[PDB]
């Protein structure tokens with residue numbers, strides 16, 4: 001029993017982290033086979049920050065302008081190119097530690113593990129969710145750009161996030177590994193800010209089921225509600241609408257606990273309207289929305 | 301910015317996990333050089349759980365009774381012995397993936413990373429604290445015994461915990477890697493239960509400093525208190541007493557934020573007496589006590 005924010009073991013990703021230096025700027029790269037992937041703003045000067053033309057900046061570079069270091073070994077770059085907002089540096093040596101991998105883009109409301117790295121050296125691992133507004137509430141300091149987010153299925157690493165920037169509210173924005181930003185953010189200096197966010201309803205419900213599996217039951221009730229009536233309450237509390245497909249996804253959890261989905265929805269409605277009255281659920285005094293149904297089933 | 305419960309990268313430990321089978325029981329072991337460490341209750345049968353005499357059960361075993369599997373590769377056991385509540389199985393092959401390591405015992409109130417494992421295969425990593433009652437609030441299922449807890453300093457893994465059992469309240473108990481239990485727990489069938497617990501005061505204060513470093517300031521005040529006046533409030537709320545050494549440990553955080561320790565203590569007294577009135581701190585609606593001052597400095 002117990003329930004923790006649990007990340008995937010990070011070893012397969014640790015073996016892929018390298019350091020990329022261009023000019024006086026250093027950040028992290030992801031070395032898979034003979035390609036190193038990193039954020040293209042590594043080629044930016046302080047000067048060309050308001051409106052950098054990355055095509056211009058890149059044509060003015062040669063392979064020798066990029067220093068890639070895999071631990072103590074220097075990797076010679078033999079090709080360079082841009083794909084959207086990521087740089088691809090072809091190196092003369094295939095990474096012998098390359099796991100099976102895929103580049104997958106995730107949906108708002110899905111979770112992933114983040115390997116925070118500095119100077120090509122992993123420093124910590126934690127679990128994140130993609131917010132509905134396409135930010136992530138990460139933990140990142142100077143030098144963390146190029147850190148990646150991922151999930152592991154069997155032996156296969158699905159890379160889904162590369163870290164690019166921190167927004168004024170202290171949340172984080174980045175791209176998939178094709179270089180395509182999550183959300184309406186760009187790799188240049190603007191007043192860009194996170195948009196309004198909302199609470200991931202299907203995840204809160206998944207986490208209430210986790211609580212029931214772990215013996216917290218004080219919030220349960222005999223009452224039930226309809227899908228339409230629940231969604232009216234969700235909208236009033238800035239919660240995402242619940243779909244029948246969400247209800248379906250919650251089926252296994254509902255069956256394991258014998259608590260109908262709409263029954264758990266009635267409990268969530270009361271929690272939103274009444275608060276906790278000084279109690280906790282799985283060691284939290286608020287409703288947690290960064291565990292998916294899959295996360296709950298995996299850990300519970 | 302941001303603040304997450306952050307574990308150490310687990311790769312150095314993933315390379316040490318193996319599967320140990322004795323009879324019909326299988327659990328996890330830790331393979332360092334040519335030794336595999338695992339919980340000795342792997343040699344128990346359902347028959348004698350009440351008062352197992354491990355010296356008797358072990359003398360009745362031979363090397364052939366222990367099956368060790370490192371991934372797809374079987375390891376021949378060439379020796380066996382018991383050290384307190386851990387089994388040491390000498391194998392004919394030194395683990396080529398052995399990191400630099402040390403066996404250290406931690407203090408109540410210290411944190412560590414846990415690599416949850418099943419059948420020798422890592423499944424997830426999360427951060428834990430040793431409770432003042434010497435339990436840990438882990439996340440562990442059937443087959444998780446033998447999972448280890450650790451910290452990493454520079455390149456060196458300090459193993460501090462091996463998982464042995466789950467208590468009736470759903471918390472967890474285990475030993476250091478010398479086989480010595482944390483707390484008054486034994487590897488046999490009793491009605492043993494976690495003793496009364498208390499809140500780790502120095503950690504709560506560290507977490508408030510993390511919040512100030514991260515821009516949460518609503519809880520600060522112009523008031524101050526004495527060390528002795530604070531401790532009287534701490535005792536009322538089942539918080540541990542604060543020492544001058546705790547004040548000294550909090551010095552660097554005090555200096556970075558310009559908030560005297562005893563000033564922050566005054567804020568904590570008010571938070572205890574008044575609650576939070578619907579506000580959050582670092583995304584929590586309760587006072588978090590599983591971040592040490594070191595964890596805060598490392599991440600902030």
Ligand SMILES: O=C(c1cc(=O)[nH]c2ccccc12)N1CCN(c2ccc(Cl)c(Cl)c2)C[C@@H]1CN1CCOCC1
Pocket residue numbers: 041044140141142143144145164165166167172186187188189301
């Ligand atoms: O390494 C970090 C960094 C990442 C992070 O997640 N959090 C941090 C916290 C504290 C200091 C630095 C960081 N940085 C350097 C590169 N950078 C950048 C450079 C060019 C382009 Cl074009 C773009 Cl998009 C982004 C982002 C960031 C600097 N920003 C400035 C605004 O205030 C937040 C920090």
Ligand SMILES: O=C(c1cc(=O)[nH]c2ccccc12)N1CCN(c2ccc(Cl)c(Cl)c2)C[C@@H]1CN1CCOCC1
Pocket residue numbers: 001341344349440441442443444445464465466467472486487488489
């Ligand atoms: O693999 C687990 C296991 C660990 C855990 O952390 N949580 C679990 C949750 C659910 C089911 C199993 C576990 N088990 C098998 C070995 N065992 C044991 C065997 C002999 C001795 Cl002598 C000792 Cl001390 C301990 C502990 C545990 C079984 N217990 C029974 C009581 O209820 C809690 C689980």
